[PDB]
């Protein structure tokens, strides 16, 4: 099942501007400035820009939460692996999308050296079909299973991954973008997607791609993604008449923002 497949390049960085904000809870609010303290992506922080296909997809730290974004139309990115040792010694969380659904499992997975999903293409380049699942060699001691609907100009998809008190929380947003290779400058809050009562530790994670077998070996289209990290900061959130967050102030950004947060402006 597993396939042995890698050149590493120095990192590139982009400007997060004012993105990565999400609804802190499920309480409806409107026409109000609400101050909250939570894990948010710091304003104007440096976000790492990864290119899956120049080929490697490195294991990254999870820290205290992750902001993930991608801009691809080929449906190359399928899912993520979250865990610690990422082997049969401990429980790991596997979140993978396929052709019709999304499957989330927590098991003592023994993952492949370089895990992926296999696909193949039609005579044309507008159609594809699944081939084989090559993410792990074995799995046992399963404690959690969940199945639902799929999670995944250009299409911009944004996710936030948090792990608090055993609950793995996912937020998401899907919007159109008209930029070639950057993050949009504007504001949009992410909404709750799913809340999984798993109860495990996560320190590292990896992104799973769908690859096809070419005459030059296993490859994919020009998939790329951005990774940022959350910090404990105070935000002032502006709820409009319809209860939608339309703006925000990062109270730790600078003296000007501190003044705005103090005066609730």
């Amino acid at each position, epitope marked *: 099942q597993c396939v042995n497949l890698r050149t590493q390049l120095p990192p590139a960085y982009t400007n997060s501007f004012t993105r990565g904000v999400y609804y802190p809870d499920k309480v409806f609010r409107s026409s109000v400035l609400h101050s909250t303290q939570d894990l948010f992506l710091p304003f104007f922080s440096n976000v790492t820009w990864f290119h899956a296909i120049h080929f490697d997809n490195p294991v990254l*730290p999870f820290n205290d939460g992750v902001y993930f974004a991608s801009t691809e139309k080929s449906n190359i990115i399928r899912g993520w692996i979250f865990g610690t040792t990422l*082997d049969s*010694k401990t429980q790991s969380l596997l979140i993978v999308n396929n052709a019709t659904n999304v499957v989330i499992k927590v098991c003592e997975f023994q993952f492949c050296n370089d895990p992926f999903l296999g696909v193949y293409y039609h005579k044309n380049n507008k159609s594809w079909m699944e081939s084989e699942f090559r993410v792990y060699s074995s799995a046992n001691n399963c404690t959690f299973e969940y199945v639902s609907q799929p999670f995944l100009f250009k299409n911009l998809r944004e996710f936030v991954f948090k792990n608090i008190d055993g609950y793995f929380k996912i937020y998401s947003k899907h919007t159109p973008i008209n930029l070639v290779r950057d993050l949009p400058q504007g504001f949009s809050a992410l909404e709750p997607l799913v809340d999984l009562p798993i109860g495990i530790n996560i320190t590292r994670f990896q992104t799973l791609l769908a690859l096809h077998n070419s005459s030059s070996g296993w490859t994919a289209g020009a998939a790329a993604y951005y990774v940022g990290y959350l910090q404990p900061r105070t935000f002032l959130l502006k709820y409009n008449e319809n209860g939608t967050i339309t703006d925000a102030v990062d109270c730790a950004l600078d003296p000007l923002s501190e003044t705005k947060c103090t005066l609730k402006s």
Partner: antibody, heavy 121, light 105 residues
């Protein structure tokens, strides 16, 4: 491509102080925590201090606790170690490193610097 | 957590099997690193998580164990394997390194 370069070593007197630094490049420095490790001539390795990626939580070895301070600046990719009240016993080569750690740092890669010698006399 | 290693030193010829023992005063499950240091150089990581081999490490190297007792093994000692080997725990802060075992020719 990945580099860690220590500087600020030299010779100081007992009771004095010395500020060491480590320049990082080739990797996402601001995503990882960092460690200081020292090795005296003829001796084995000894762990000194650890700082988290955000520069928040800090940890020290009992032998340096109360004397040494660890800090970092993620806008310059620089790690610092400020040592006060230095003693003869503190003579050692100091390294900056990113140690592989699946519990606290979440690091999948192991990186080491060159080492800078600090002598107390 | 206190760490110790045994023997403090050993010598063996090329082709010999070399084993190094590392022990901990506390149960640290499977959270132990093995490093190889040559004179004048920084330590290199060979094994993590007790028995997980790092990429690029020769197949002649191996290791196993858990809790308070760990073993590092070289199935066939090479002339290039003359180095001081250390065990390190990362179960709980502060982190520590063992005394170091010297392997001679």
């Amino acid at each position: 491509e990945v580099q860690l370069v220590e500087s600020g070593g030299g010779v100081v007197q007992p009771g004095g102080s010395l500020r060491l630094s480590c320049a990082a490049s080739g990797f996402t420095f601001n995503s990882y925590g960092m460690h200081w490790v020292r090795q005296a001539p003829g001796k084995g390795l000894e762990w000194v201090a650890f700082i988290r990626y955000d520069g928040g939580n800090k940890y020290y070895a009992d032998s340096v606790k109360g004397r040494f301070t660890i800090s970092r600046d993620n806008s310059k990719n620089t790690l610092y170690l400020q040592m006060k009240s230095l003693r003869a016993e503190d003579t050692a080569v100091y390294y900056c490193a990113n140690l592989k750690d699946s519990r606290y740092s979440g690091s999948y890669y192991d990186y080491w610097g060159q080492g800078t010698l600090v002598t107390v006399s | 957590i206190w760490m110790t290693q045994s023997p403090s030193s050993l010598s063996a010829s090329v082709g010999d099997r070399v084993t190094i023992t590392c022990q901990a005063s506390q149960d640290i499950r499977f959270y132990l690193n093995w490093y190889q240091q040559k004179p004048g150089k920084a330590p290199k990581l060979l094994i993590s998580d007790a028995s997980n081999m790092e990429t690029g490490v020769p197949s002649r190297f191996s290791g196993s164990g858990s809790g308070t007792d760990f073993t590092f093994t070289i199935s066939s000692l090479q002339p290039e394997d003359i180095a001081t080997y250390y065990c390190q725990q990362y179960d709980n802060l502060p982190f520590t390194f063992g005394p170091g075992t010297k392997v001679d020719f």
